[PDB]
Amino acid sequence: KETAAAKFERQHMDSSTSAASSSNYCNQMMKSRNLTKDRCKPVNTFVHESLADVQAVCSQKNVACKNGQTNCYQSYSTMSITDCRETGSSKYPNCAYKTTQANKHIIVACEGNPYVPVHGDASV
């Protein structure tokens, strides 16, 4: 139903904020982006850069994917990101996440025409 590129945007893009300035950021975002509809997605990362900046990574450093694929790319620069990980006292339908803001290089798998991100590899 959802194209891979569209799914990547919904799960990983948050260009409206510069960084997570609250401990409840993940709880709110995971719900908003519909990542806990039928189950709590254990881990997810949101990138605080423009969509153009993230799409541009597909033309940056080509690196191997965690599974051997060769269509992965690492951003030349660090980007503001927020890591969301399910908390211990977390249980669907009441999911709970820990919010970890950081600045790191992202790694994405790209595909298609246009050649865009479709998966977000273990961001450096």
UniProtKB/Swiss-Prot annotation:
It is found in: Secreted. One of its GO terms (molecular function) is lyase activity. Changing H119A: Loss of activity. This is Ribonuclease pancreatic. The lineage of its organism: Eukaryota, Metazoa, Chordata, Craniata, Vertebrata. Belongs to the pancreatic ribonuclease family. One of its GO terms (cellular component) is extracellular region. Glycans are attached at K1, K7, N34, K37, K41. Endonuclease that catalyzes the cleavage of RNA on the 3' side of pyrimidine nucleotides. Acts on single-stranded and double-stranded RNA. Substrate binds at K7, R10, K41, P42, V43, N44, T45, K66, R85. It is an enzyme of class 4 (lyase). The keyword Cell membrane does not apply. Interacts with and forms tight 1:1 complexes with RNH1. Dimerization of two such complexes may occur. Interaction with RNH1 inhibits this protein. Monomer. It comes from Bos taurus. Changing H12A: Loss of activity. Disulfide bonds join C26-C84, C40-C95, C58-C110, C65-C72. Pancreas. Its EC number is 4.6.1.18. Its main location: secreted.
